[PDB]
Scaffold this active site. Sequence first.
Site, PDB file in Angstrom:
ATOM      1  N   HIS B 354       0.732  -1.001  -0.103  1.00  0.00           N
ATOM      2  CA  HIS B 354       0.101   0.148  -0.081  1.00  0.00           C
ATOM      3  C   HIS B 354       0.851   1.086  -0.093  1.00  0.00           C
ATOM      4  CE1 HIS B 354      -3.915  -1.602   0.155  1.00  0.00           C
ATOM      5  NE2 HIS B 354      -3.468  -2.807   1.151  1.00  0.00           N
ATOM      6  N   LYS B 560     -10.114  14.069   3.744  1.00  0.00           N
ATOM      7  CA  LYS B 560      -8.973  13.039   3.759  1.00  0.00           C
ATOM      8  C   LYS B 560      -8.048  13.358   4.993  1.00  0.00           C
ATOM      9  CE  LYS B 560      -8.477  12.980  -0.275  1.00  0.00           C
ATOM     10  NZ  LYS B 560      -7.789  12.147  -1.322  1.00  0.00           N
ATOM     11  N   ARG B 561      -7.289  12.416   5.546  1.00  0.00           N
ATOM     12  CA  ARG B 561      -6.270  12.575   6.532  1.00  0.00           C
ATOM     13  C   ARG B 561      -5.621  13.739   6.545  1.00  0.00           C
ATOM     14  NH1 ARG B 561      -2.281  10.372   8.415  1.00  0.00           N
ATOM     15  NH2 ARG B 561      -1.783  10.355   6.128  1.00  0.00           N
ATOM     16  N   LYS B 566      -0.908  15.590   2.231  1.00  0.00           N
ATOM     17  CA  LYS B 566      -2.287  15.766   1.602  1.00  0.00           C
ATOM     18  C   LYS B 566      -2.620  17.311   0.950  1.00  0.00           C
ATOM     19  CE  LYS B 566      -3.643  11.376   2.485  1.00  0.00           C
ATOM     20  NZ  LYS B 566      -4.121  10.279   1.460  1.00  0.00           N
ATOM     21  N   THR B 672      -9.283   5.724  -2.667  1.00  0.00           N
ATOM     22  CA  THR B 672     -10.395   5.274  -3.007  1.00  0.00           C
ATOM     23  C   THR B 672     -11.722   6.308  -3.088  1.00  0.00           C
ATOM     24  OG1 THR B 672     -10.143   4.552  -0.816  1.00  0.00           O
ATOM     25  CG2 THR B 672     -10.344   2.884  -2.487  1.00  0.00           C
ATOM     26  N   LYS B 676     -14.991   7.024  -5.435  1.00  0.00           N
ATOM     27  CA  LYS B 676     -16.512   6.968  -4.944  1.00  0.00           C
ATOM     28  C   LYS B 676     -17.170   8.516  -5.521  1.00  0.00           C
ATOM     29  CE  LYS B 676     -15.277   4.973  -0.303  1.00  0.00           C
ATOM     30  NZ  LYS B 676     -14.636   5.746   1.210  1.00  0.00           N
TER      31      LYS B 676
END
Lengths: 830, 830
Positions: B354, B560-561, B566, B672, B676
């Site tokens: 991952h 997201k995190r 990010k 992911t 979506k």
Amino acid sequence: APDAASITSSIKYHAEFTPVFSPERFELPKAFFATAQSVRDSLLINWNATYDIYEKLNMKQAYYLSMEFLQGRALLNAIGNLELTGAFAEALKNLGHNLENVASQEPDAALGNGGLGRLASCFLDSLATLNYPAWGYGLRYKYGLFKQRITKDGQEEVAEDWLEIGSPWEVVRNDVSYPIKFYGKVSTGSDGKRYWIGGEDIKAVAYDVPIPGYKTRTTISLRLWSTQVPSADFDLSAFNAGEHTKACEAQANAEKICYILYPGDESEEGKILRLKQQYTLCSASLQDIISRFERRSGDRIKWEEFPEKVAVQMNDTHPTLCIPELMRILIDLKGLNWNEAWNITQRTVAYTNHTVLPEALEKWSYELMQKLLPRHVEIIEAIDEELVHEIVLKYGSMDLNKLEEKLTTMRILENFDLPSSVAEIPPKKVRMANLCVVGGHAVNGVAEIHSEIVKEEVFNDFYELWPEKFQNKTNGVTPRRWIRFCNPPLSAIITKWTGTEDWVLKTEKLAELQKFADNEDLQNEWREAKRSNKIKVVSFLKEKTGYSVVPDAMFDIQVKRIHEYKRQLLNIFGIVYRYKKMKEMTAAERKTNFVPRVCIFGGKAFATYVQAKRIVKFITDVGATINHDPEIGDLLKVVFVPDYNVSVAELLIPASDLSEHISTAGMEASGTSNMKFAMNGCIQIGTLDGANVEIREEVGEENFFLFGAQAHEIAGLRKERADGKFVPDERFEEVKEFVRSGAFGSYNYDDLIGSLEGNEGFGRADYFLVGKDFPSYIECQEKVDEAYRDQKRWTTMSILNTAGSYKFSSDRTIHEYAKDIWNIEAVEIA
Amino acid sequence: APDAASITSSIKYHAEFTPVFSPERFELPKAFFATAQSVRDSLLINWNATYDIYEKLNMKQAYYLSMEFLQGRALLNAIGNLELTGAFAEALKNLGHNLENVASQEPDAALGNGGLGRLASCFLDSLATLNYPAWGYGLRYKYGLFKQRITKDGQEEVAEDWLEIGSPWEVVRNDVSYPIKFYGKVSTGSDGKRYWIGGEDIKAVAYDVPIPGYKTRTTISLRLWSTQVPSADFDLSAFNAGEHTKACEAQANAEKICYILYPGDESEEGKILRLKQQYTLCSASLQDIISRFERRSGDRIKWEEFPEKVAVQMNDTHPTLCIPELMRILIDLKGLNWNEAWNITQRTVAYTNHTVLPEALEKWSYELMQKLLPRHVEIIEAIDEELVHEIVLKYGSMDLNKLEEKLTTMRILENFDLPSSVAEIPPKKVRMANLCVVGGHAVNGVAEIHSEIVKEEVFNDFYELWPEKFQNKTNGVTPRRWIRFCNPPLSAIITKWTGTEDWVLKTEKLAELQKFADNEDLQNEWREAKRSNKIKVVSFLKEKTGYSVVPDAMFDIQVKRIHEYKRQLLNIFGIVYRYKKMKEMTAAERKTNFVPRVCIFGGKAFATYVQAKRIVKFITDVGATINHDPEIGDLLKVVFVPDYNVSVAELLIPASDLSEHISTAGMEASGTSNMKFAMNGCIQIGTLDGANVEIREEVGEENFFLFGAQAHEIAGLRKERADGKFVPDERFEEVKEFVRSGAFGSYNYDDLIGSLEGNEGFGRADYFLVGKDFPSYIECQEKVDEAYRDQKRWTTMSILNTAGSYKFSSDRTIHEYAKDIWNIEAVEIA
């Protein structure tokens, strides 16, 4: 009206669709759970029906508060009272099980310890059977007191597993949670009211255990409190840091309140835990009771109607804090004034006393209680004053010398200053017992003589001041659990001979057996039944003690808390003497003088009580010796049954020939096991104490082996030992010597025998008059041995013990509490 | 075939007779539970049917092991997949509730954190929908990771309450408990086998969460492990003593394994807890898998058939210990020999990678691992040798210099001695990643480019040695949860236009929307739907953030995190620029240049990561300013949604116009959430990384806003900054200055801006090229702003995003794993 096929469906659903095990196969543990859930399905119907009528009718409800409930196993009594024992047995048949095997899977609910708890339990059975609106409140203990292993070394203790899988009987009410506060501080608002803030905050969550009445729908509640803290209180910061222990602290500290029952209180840590337990029960319970009061009260909510709607019964001095707590609520929260509140309190709260000696009554460190429940300590000082002033008001100040006496006796605060007082580092304590006498409208004992002792010794001056308070309420046991269900064979006989089956309810009909106590048909039945029960026990004994005994001996049982004052030591000594005599006889000389016995001991020793544990170790060794001695064979067996609990008693009692109740005379308040034994036709050897007195009276003195010095005689007899005016029997020495001879193996019993020698010193000098009462005892056992030979006589004594029982039904006891203390009327649940 | 009236009965039973609340009234919390239990009634039927066929058929079963599962809420998908959403809605109608209100009572199951878990979850949905015999194994975490509050001060963390009342979905299997051992020591028996004894002993108990397939009966299991210790281990001696803390230790130490997810591992204490977690999962899971193997195998039990009957998939490097553990079992317990076992192992175990960067891969202290799992460390050294010898076997010893290179790269033990080696205090570690590549038959990445990166960079030499191992398996999301259920309006459109409703299963039919992307009827529908979803969000946003926003703006979402990499910092900076520009405009000048936006941020900051938390605090302030600035009104809103979880995403995603995926290029493996979003017609602005690449390709480059430097360019661009050859844009400075001006209130952001300044130093020097990519970003946002004006275009881009999705269905991903890694065939559950 559910039939067996319906119940079969019921069991199958809960087995698959409310499951707690893998889907494969229908083993016994799975089968139990499914059956229990199935039963509860029904309990819940009636629980609701009841709950509803009680809400709608808004009559007076009674609340029994106890630190312990000794509920034991629920299945058989639940289906029993519901009258479905038939259908359930059938249903399990088709599922390829049998009822008794299923029922023996269920752990005993470990929510209590001694008779205090078993009283409470019986009471609930009656309360419900009699349709009286009342609930129990108690703590939901995780690990009970302890489970007893008997090992080569004696007693080992281990935490109860009863909840490992969880209890199929209980119902969590998540929306019933109350705040409990410890520590912190008090202040005054500008409204002039008191404010108790800070400290620790925890929740208390209700769990309901339904209690079904016999042949009624009345299903009441034992509501148990479990202490916890919301998840928010888990300290993620500390946990991720690395201090795992520390993060858990909040929750650990809250839950431990409910871990074990009577935690060790040597430490300051233990004492605080104890107070926390006590307070939790009182606070949570009162909050719930009041909440329900208000709720039923709608708009026309009047606080002078309260005692007319609520009665709280304090089972012993543990729920003492109900008095200060209820004051606190009625004042700080409901905003009444002191007299209003105090009047409400007194007309609500009642006390039940359980102890004979004024030192068994509990006292608390002022410092500690004041540091933990500061707002309570305030309210307690308040009452102590009010009291001091009313003592002064009566009696007058003319006597001075005597008023000084009456204050030091009657005052709730021990080692405190009076407030204003004519008078022309000993530690500060709170006398909970005194507080209970003051704040309640009733103070009752538990047996004629005991109730007398509280009036005339324990709470002496109090009785003079307020006689209208003092009462008696002689203890009882439920004939449902203790005859109808535990002893199916005897029940069948009883139904036959008394014509009806109404005797389970109208238990006085037991007395009709009297007329038939000679009838030799009934004797033949009675003996077949008593044998049949013993048969079961033989099997049990093998599985638990490893000892094969014969059914064709006298069953000689002493099952109760292993204390010096209970004198297990006496019975076993008597056993030792019998054995020595046997060994100095020819084989058919043995046969001639001794009936074959199986002497059954059981009960739990306080973990830390070195002598009690030594006693247990002794009995096992005595056993080991006697049982495997081939010179003795089946003439004598000694077994110690490990882990005596309700369930064990439900098995031994039906199968007993003789029960031993041989405490140092006068020291017991009541007893309940004796009542249970008598009911099953067991004959009792005992000293004149507690309800031995009342049982003896009612069954007839000719059907009860009495022995040993009486209460009055005890003072003098200690005096005698202390002056060196005691002469031991030489049979007593014969035993002591025989033990010392290393006769029972190589464990050394010097220290044990030590407690029986000397004339002073804390552990020495046979303070419990075992040596004294020993002659009368073994003598009395001779009589027994003889009466067992005359089977026609023995069987009449048996039958009459049963016929004498009826007055010890807890139905009677509850009818009395209900009418003479709480004042509640039966509510029909159509 | 249950109808609505039947389900009404069902709900009423479970409400009364399997209750978790007081009997009074049918509030929402009560209603939820009853509904859920009701649903589970059905899940259990099918769970059993499945379980049975799988036992009887004894085909190959697959086992997905993950430290996290992100299951979110179960109700709607359960009733969805069962196809009873109609009946349940009706049933709740009659009970005076509505479905969506009930369903919103249910906590998110806090069993996972990021996409790793959500992948695992989606996979289970597919596995079950596709009838593939497979289960998940995971830990049952009590308090999740944390619940996020957003306060005036920023992010606060608090323990999840999801289990406070308990989960109506799960099933305890008390008869499924395995021993787990830590610490202790190894010895050799006279049979010559190894014996691992002593240490700590705990149990691991299975809890099943049924996972229902869509339009099938195939109901598989997420089996979760909860660690505990039998009650016997509670130390009564210590407790009564007074050392309450101490008595609990045994049980505290065992249960903490399951408290929280990714516990803080700064401390030695934390690292050990981590290992304990990892091992628990592997050991418990393998024991259960093997047990089931043997059980199905009857007599003809053959260990060479094992890999033909079982496949274990290690989701990332956490379940690494499966390799050594399975060896241990097959050797020490099943008594095979090394080669036999190792062959079995390899043909069972597969690895999924991952991570992009070789340092994200986990390494363990030799000392520590060896001290905790000593028998494993043995097995690991063994494999490390065998490997070393096979490296030597190929390559030869001619090169020496190069063989030296290949050993230091490929060796599982880092900083160890070779065994026999021609050669003519740096800490000792275990490279779990390496171990996983060695012991497995498969190593897969999660997206084309990523899989490539593992082949050609991460596991370089390994690929050369064993190319046949390396694979790709591009990630996916279930169209059930992520379209069919979360977006009812869009679903209705899709069904209409594609003719059938088969698209939930045969998701390729989404592509047929292509032909209609101009059709202005479909656009009108599509916009009505997207608006309708936004409407819901407006309400949510008010309730959670306290901010009223208008539906008639672009929804610009980055969820997201909250990490620097990010680049939430980027988006918000872009937002800052837009705002500054607006403030230096006339009112209708503002109107002209800017479309109305609601910029939605969400996600969780690592508790201890000072910058990430500062970022969150920034976004809230930026918001506070902009939202209440009356010069801006409804032209711009900024909100930070607290506590982003599956459920939040199920609500924001259907209602999104633009989603932000703007990581520093090349650093993401897959993603992911993008998949979506695309599915719901959301358009994506992002950098060229992960599956941004694959989404862009499939939806079409004309329907995806791309910007910023690419992967290759990054090395050079850091170089540049480090040489002082970077020139910042003056708009970038404009922002920095504007912040420094105290514009967003009085919180000081010096340190924050600090990370963006300098050319070196650990926290300094904008290592994440925010300043660099900033021009291309805001530029790209202009394009966006413009395309939003051309509604016919915007709506086509939308429709085409959806039409491009089909390949990101997790059905596809699972079909691939199933056929190209595990080798399992669909089992029909008639």
